[PDB]
Automatic annotation (TrEMBL), chain A:
Keyword Transmembrane helix: no
Record keyword Lyase present: yes
Taxonomic lineage from the root: Bacteria, Pseudomonadati, Pseudomonadota, Betaproteobacteria, Burkholderiales
Sequence ranges assigned to domain SsuA/THI5-like in this UniProt record: 87-141
Protein name (database record): 4,5-dihydroxyphthalate decarboxylase
Organism, scientific name: Comamonas testosteroni (strain DSM 14576 / KF-1) (Pseudomonas testosteroni)
Amino acid sequence: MNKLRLSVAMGDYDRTRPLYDGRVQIDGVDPVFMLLNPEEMFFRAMRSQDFDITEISFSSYLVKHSQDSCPYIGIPVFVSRAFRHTSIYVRKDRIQRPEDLKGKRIGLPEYQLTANVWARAILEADHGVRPCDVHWVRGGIETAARPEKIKLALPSDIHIENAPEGETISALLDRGDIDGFIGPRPPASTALRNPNIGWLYDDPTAAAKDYYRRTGIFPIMHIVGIRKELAAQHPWLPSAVFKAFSQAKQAALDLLEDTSATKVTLPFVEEQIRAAKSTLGDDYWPYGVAASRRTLEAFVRHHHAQGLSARLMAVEELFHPSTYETYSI
Amino acid sequence: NKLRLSVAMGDYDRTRPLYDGRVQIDGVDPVFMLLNPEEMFFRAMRSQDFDITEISFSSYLVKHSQDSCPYIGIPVFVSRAFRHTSIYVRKDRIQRPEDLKGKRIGLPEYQLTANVWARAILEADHGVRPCDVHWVRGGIETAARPEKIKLALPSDIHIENAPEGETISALLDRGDIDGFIGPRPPASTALRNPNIGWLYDDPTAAAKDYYRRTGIFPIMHIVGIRKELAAQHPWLPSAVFKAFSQAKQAALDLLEDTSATKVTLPFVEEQIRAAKSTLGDDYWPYGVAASRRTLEAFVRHHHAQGLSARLMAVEELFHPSTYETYSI
Ligand SMILES: [Zn+2]
Ligand SMILES: [Zn+2]
């Protein structure tokens, strides 16, 4: 009857519902859950250490983790994965092709955002548009005032100036003070209605499938974290958490694959699952290190290149030691 | 003082906001139970467990056409999907759909909502009419499975039980049957047979053509309220219609946001946009007007296939108070 009363903060996803509801339980924990949008969760996690266990920005975690001054230790539960080709909005009236973004003004909400890292990596690795080749403009998407959640020491070849106060990135794109936009959300709707704003990539699905064939990278946005002290005091707690989230994803996938009635409000789910399994592999959204090696390997590289890691991190130091492998029968 | 009602629905994105209280039913204190379709419809039709329940559109229509269904429907279509994916065949025998004339197709029960849409495709598009087929009925996962309600099928429909103890899935695996239709694919052991797969090589493609041609986004499930309840509380149909409506809007609001994709799929952003393109902004519509072509076709097929006792008019499908909602 004696368990750990911990707070747990995650998103509201199919892959977390079975946790939320108790269908999946955490060994030796009595959870207390709060379901949060990413923005709220990471702001609070990084500046306030609200939670015992929390979903976190992979980027932000790495910033603080690279300096051994992060309150949390990560586990390889990738509750957020997604290609971020869809992440890049441009003024189609100006930009014909990605290479045109050299020496333009791109806006982002904060530089160190996980999606932004993957996005800048695409622009570098396959259009030659390097961070330093861009006038960066930082300001909110919906609300005009938005800080960098953690302080950065970016190399000074990265030119970066705040948005005019009171004006969002969304607005600045609308008026075309910036030529481009990257972040985890599209620009605000008023902006979206401008006929001249749209994805850089005309066919993001196609470009991302190519990317994946080329690199084997299914970008990771979010990991999960536990307070350092907690992991030290309870050496089993990392593994326990890893398992639960793992089970929850399996439970949700079990439900999702059933076509008696499709569990998301989309058409063609049957077809999608099978296409996903075809392009990515049966375990298309894997948790776990080995199963994500290419992606992890790339992240540390990009993170260090883009100027957010102290030194170039080793996959081997990214997570709590007890989580680089799970048992099998 | 509210109405203590039991509510039985599936566990979908579009029902979560109901389940967890985010969306509430006017004047009701709901007790929710999340059920797989098979269990829910079995219980709903044969023992009237629930005050409000998701139901087989087909089943409901069977009992509703005889004016002796305990429930009255509302146009909350918590289950929609194309059922091109619904037809598995032995690819080694059936090269194209027309080959199914005079073959043995297996199904779990004849009256099943997806089966109706499926037989309609085979008729409307390949000339394979119900009567042209040796039907075999047995479970997919368990061998013994009753027809939920009695049917008076016209005698041109030849239909026999599966060899006792054997599932449809097995029967397809051994190739005692050439074809299979149902809301679920055959069991996995069967699925491993390299000779089994979809009739349609590109179901998505065929369905998008179908939709261009007909404007039909098949409905599987509606929602239902006990007759007495609707009579005693003339506002209760409308209230329920709204709640489910809001829950779907809430879920769609969450799903469209790309901060983190709420389903475990890749490319959700792209999917949504494609779906909206082919189907319309309200790609998964509740409500009658927005579903007219689909509703129209259903009653037709249902009556053709021999499951409607009377001619049904779209106008008598749902409780009268739900043929329209207000607007600002
Ligand atoms: Zn981020
Ligand atoms: Zn059904």
